[PDB]
């Protein structure tokens, strides 16, 4: 399975690192893709294992939690108005504008999606489009990818 609806894409105002998690978690609650307190577990994992990815030009974060809190594979994408700091995933303060929240319970799907994410964020042309395109265009270009 995949699952990625149009209301799994949204912009966020000039927000806390914690607030971002909740904002993206809510549609995944509204469809039963995850447990009631999915955002709670995601937040806690981030404080121990940060997901900030230092890539230029657009900072990226991939917040998630253990697959045992998922019910159906899903992805939520957020575009931050102003850069919000995420701790570096490698222990090294990363300014993030794009957030890929992963609610994947299947390991092979987790590794497939992470592989795909890696290739996309290394494309500084598509990363730019994400900063200007709207909720429809972003959803459209992203949906194609299988």
């Amino acid at each position, epitope marked *: 399975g995949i699952h990625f609806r149009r209301h799994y894409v949204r912009h966020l105002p000039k927000v806390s690192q914690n607030d971002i998690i909740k904002a993206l978690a809510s549609p995944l609650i509204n469809d039963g893709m995850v447990v009631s307190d999915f955002a709670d577990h995601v937040i806690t994992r981030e404080q121990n294992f940060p997901t900030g990815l230092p890539v230029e030009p657009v900072g990226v974060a991939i917040p998630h939690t253990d697959s*045992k809190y998922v019910r159906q594979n899903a992805i939520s994408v957020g575009i931050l108005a102003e850069p919000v700091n995420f701790e570096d995933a490698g222990g090294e303060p990363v300014p993030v504008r794009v957030v890929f929240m992963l609610a994947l319970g299947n*390991w092979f799907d987790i590794t497939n999606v*992470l592989w795909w994410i*890696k290739a996309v964020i290394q494309d500084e042309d598509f990363m730019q489009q994400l900063l200007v395109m709207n909720d429809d265009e972003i959803y459209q270009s992203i949906y194609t990818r299988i």
Partner: antibody
Amino acid sequence: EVQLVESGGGLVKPGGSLRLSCSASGFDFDNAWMTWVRQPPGKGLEWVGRITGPGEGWSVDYAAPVEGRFTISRLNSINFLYLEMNNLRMEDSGLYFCARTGKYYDFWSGYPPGEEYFQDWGRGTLVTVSS
Amino acid sequence: YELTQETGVSVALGDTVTITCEGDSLESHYASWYQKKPGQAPILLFYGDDNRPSGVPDRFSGDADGNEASLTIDGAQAEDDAEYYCSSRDKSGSRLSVFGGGTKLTVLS
């Protein structure tokens, strides 16, 4: 540390059947991936098969030599892993281990589906296939 | 299948030694490493890029390059006399796993 206890080993005739069991405690068994591994006498370790967890729908993968002959299952309610072995041959003889299996994927350098590693092992049960 | 290792390697007590493992799948996948002594269950030593389980001594370390992965023991002790097995995928992208044939480390002197 955690405890893995295999049993069911013994003597079986070629062509015969056998069922091994592994009892597990000390970790989250329901969410754990579990692997069977064997060691023929005087030889190395040989991966037999692995059963995944609920997110992967309990899917099982098998080594080529046992595919179609062996069946791995699990009973989570009592924390048991099983290996059901049909049409046994002499080359199936050996010490059979069950192992709690971790999954690893490095984001920047990894390739799907990452790697599995074996963090805890039982002591094994001995299977002898002979006439 | 088929990761491959030397059948045996020797090392002077207190000296450095490296055990190698080779295979196509190592181009894309990390190896994990196990120590095994006769009559005793395998012990995980090292896995992934740079991961050492908490109880494993610091002198064990792994590396990887091309189709090769290596376990280095920096200053071998008698207790390190054992069989060492590497493990990884059988092919790039495969859902199956495999072991190398094992390398016998003998500690001399």
